[PDB]
Amino acid sequence: MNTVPFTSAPIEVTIGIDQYSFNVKENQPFHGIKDIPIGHVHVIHFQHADNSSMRYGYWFDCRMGNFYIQYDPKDGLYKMMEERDGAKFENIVHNFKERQMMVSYPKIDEDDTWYNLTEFVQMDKIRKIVRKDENQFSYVDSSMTTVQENELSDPAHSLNYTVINFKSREAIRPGHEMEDFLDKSYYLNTVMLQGIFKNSSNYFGELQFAFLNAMFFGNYGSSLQWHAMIELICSSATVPKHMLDKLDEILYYQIKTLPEQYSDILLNERVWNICLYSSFQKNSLHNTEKIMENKYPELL
């Protein structure tokens, strides 16, 4: 179990750690989160009490370093930092745990939600979508745009998702125009899976990361990426049977974790109605279709 200590909490902020959220009052004696499960990526995120504009946060993996949070009063946000001196860090954390100033990652033991949402998400792949290579952790906020978005304005601060575009020469083989546009298996299995992602684990990893950035930061470009990656699979007549079975499970837990009161913006009616009711895979996502119908029969 690892620890993300905080230097202090000078401004009133709602802090989220994965799917959980808690409030810290201005200058309350808060010195971090302890008992964070090793073996997964994590995200620690922030919404200031004063300005509900800009949710922001940090993707990290405690196996890759000792990280802490410190408010910066010049740039006005809680910044993640790495401590290189290991003995210094252990001593800081031990003092804060002794004085009981850290809240506890409240993992119910029966609870596999965070695993099911980050199964294929790797820190090494996150870092290639979010470029800032002097840090082992990756910053994301609500306003960041995607590479494809910038093609439709700062590249250093972009989300470098894999561009998917159904009416593009990458997507459409000369001479197979109708075939490839109505059944995207070529683009899925050859261009993206074999060519770009190499395997379905990396594909599912980007899909899961996009959903999480959409849900936790309301990042609009990530929501577009998540829906596109779903649509490309649902619109392919030929998909490995293990990928369809895993997709159903992935989407189930995403739909299950989604806040009910954000479903109106984070879910695209056209994509979901097509995927569940018109597409080649309309019959292949039983768990996802059942939870969608019981939880959001309106959207449909």
Binding site: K167, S168, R169, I172, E177, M178, F181
Partner: protein, 237 residues
């Protein structure tokens, strides 16, 4: 964006453009089988691709053989149309290629867009206008060449005959759309109007009769009557 009555003069400026109508590409007769079921028999069709400024009709005849052994024909027809239009553009010298292609039905947008990915600078556009191009098979010489074809074939016609010698392309298009609207609302009446007078003839290389300027005003008037009437006979007004 889409084309409507607001931007109606753009059709006659100096940017090359083509209208594409696919209505007549996949044509069938429906009939009963000996077992009392219903089947279709396809007949020859055509793509109607027209430069509205010059009257240049590129009429691509779609022979029934193109459908043999194919499924989902009404959907294939749209992609067949787009493949032929793309082939037509590629066959033209760069300086004759259109800068815009306007489709008369929105279902052609994605098929044409996908076939034209190689032409990023050709705009594919829909229209809000209700253009009567489907009545093109009511023009006798066009219907005749489509029905006699025994193989795929492209036939070149000027849909304005010689009109541009006397009238502008705005006026010629307006006359065309009036003639075609009439033919579409009441083909028999429309055609009686056009050929009532034995003394007026159609030149061998023309589609429409050789009318004087004065006779066109009378003709054009007679066509507007028909379209109003048949709108009463159809709306009891």
């Amino acid at each position: 964006g889409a084309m409507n009555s607001s931007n109606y003069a753009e059709l006659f400026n100096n940017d090359i453009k083509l209208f594409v109508d696919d209505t007549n590409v996949y044509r069938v007769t429906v009939h009963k089988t000996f077992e009392g079921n219903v089947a279709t028999k396809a007949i020859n069709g055509c793509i109607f691709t027209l430069n509205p400024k010059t009257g240049h009709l590129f009429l691509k005849i779609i022979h029934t053989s193109v459908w043999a052994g194919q499924k989902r024909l009404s959907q294939l027809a749209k992609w067949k149309t787009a493949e032929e239009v793309s082939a037509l553009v590629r066959s033209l010298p760069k300086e004759e290629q259109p800068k815009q292609i306007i489709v008369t039905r929105k279902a052609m947008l994605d098929p044409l867009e996908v076939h034209m990915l190689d032409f990023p600078n050709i705009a594919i556009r829909p229209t809000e206008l209700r253009l009567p191009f489907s009545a093109a098979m009511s023009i006798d010489k066009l219907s005749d060449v489509v029905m006699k074809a025994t193989e795929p074939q492209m036939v070149l016609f000027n849909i304005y005959d010689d009109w541009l010698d006397r009238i502008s392309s705005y006026t010629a298009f307006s006359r065309l759309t009036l003639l075609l609207r009439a033919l579409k609302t009441n083909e028999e009446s429309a055609k009686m109007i056009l050929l009532s007078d034995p003394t007026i003839t159609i030149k061998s290389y023309h589609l429409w009769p050789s009318f004087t300027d004065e006779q066109w005003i009378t003709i054009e008037s007679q066509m507007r009557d028909l379209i109003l009437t048949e709108y009463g006979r159809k709306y009891n007004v």
